Write a protein that binds this ligand. Sequence first.
Ligand SMILES: Nc1ncnc2c1ncn2[C@@H]1O[C@H](COP(=O)(O)OP(=O)(O)O)[C@@H](O)[C@H]1O
Ligand SMILES: C[NH2+]Cc1ccc(-c2ccccc2)c(Cl)c1
Ligand SMILES: [Mg+2]
Length: 325
Amino acid sequence: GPVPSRARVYTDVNTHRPSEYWDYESHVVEWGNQDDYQLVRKLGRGKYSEVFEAINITNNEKVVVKILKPVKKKKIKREIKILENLRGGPNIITLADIVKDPVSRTPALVFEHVNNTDFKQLYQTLTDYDIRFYMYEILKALDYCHSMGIMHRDVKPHNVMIDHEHRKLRLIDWGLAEFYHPGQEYNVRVASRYFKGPELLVDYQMYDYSLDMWSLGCMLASMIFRKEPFFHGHDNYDQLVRIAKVLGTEDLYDYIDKYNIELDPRFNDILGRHSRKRWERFVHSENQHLVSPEALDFLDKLLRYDHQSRLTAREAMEHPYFYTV
Ligand SMILES: Nc1ncnc2c1ncn2[C@@H]1O[C@H](COP(=O)(O)OP(=O)(O)O)[C@@H](O)[C@H]1O
Ligand SMILES: C[NH2+]Cc1ccc(-c2ccccc2)c(Cl)c1
Ligand SMILES: [Mg+2]
């Protein structure tokens, strides 16, 4: 079978903690009354939620109410425990309250309000400095949750709220997040297609916090190169082919050999053979103002087949790309 793997950082943070911290199944959830909140308008509608802007009628403050479509009860409890554990963390969305509507009995999570700037509007107004500043802000959130023994597992532009006027960033949507336990086999059907690490695509279940670092690398490539998404797969099998077209097929085989991964028979038939491309080949007239040798070196140390070889969030924070900022 496959060779075991563990995170290079915060490996045993949950092992040395009591049951209370990570056993979300035994966590007691106390649901308040939604009558303190008046729903104002719909902000977004996710995979299994309806997000509304709301007013807390007890203090006239704006909040956000995420109304959960009652899926597996264990999943709601997992998201609550993680948000409660990370509450107050740098650039982490703050869970202010947990409520239930008296008549519907539907569960709902109450969050601090974020005045989100449009992805297309932000994409056309960001400078080299803005990208470095916001990348550093995301790194603070990731180093923090990883230190708290949690992997986000759905890192992407849509899960990062930015109030550009106030230069305020929040990592949201902790519904796929999970407690890291060294040597544990996790579900590989996590993260959004374009952001899936090669470990998920090759069905390597013993992954860690390093999955988040790959996703972060995909977001950085899309920003500096102005190609969204950067790895544009049409399905999960094709997603690995898009990565292989850039990173090369040689290093993919070295990766599967190192971890003794049993690659699906179908892959050899669609992967083909591809050379490793130089990051500079993605530089053009429309994006050259966002590219620098430091950005390319940083991106290269994030987007690597081998999850263990990828930089950790704290290592990434020390990289020369962040010196100016
Ligand atoms: N704190 C927030 N402030 C503002 N908008 C938010 C906030 N949290 C969520 N949203 C909006 O709601 C959408 C869906 O919420 P999300 O937490 O990502 O749920 P899901 O797991 O269903 O995708 C987001 O993409 C965003 O537009
Ligand atoms: C407002 N939600 C979309 C969005 C847009 C841009 C970024 C982004 C900006 C600079 C560097 C890296 C990513 C992010 Cl995280 C999210
Ligand atoms: Mg989401």
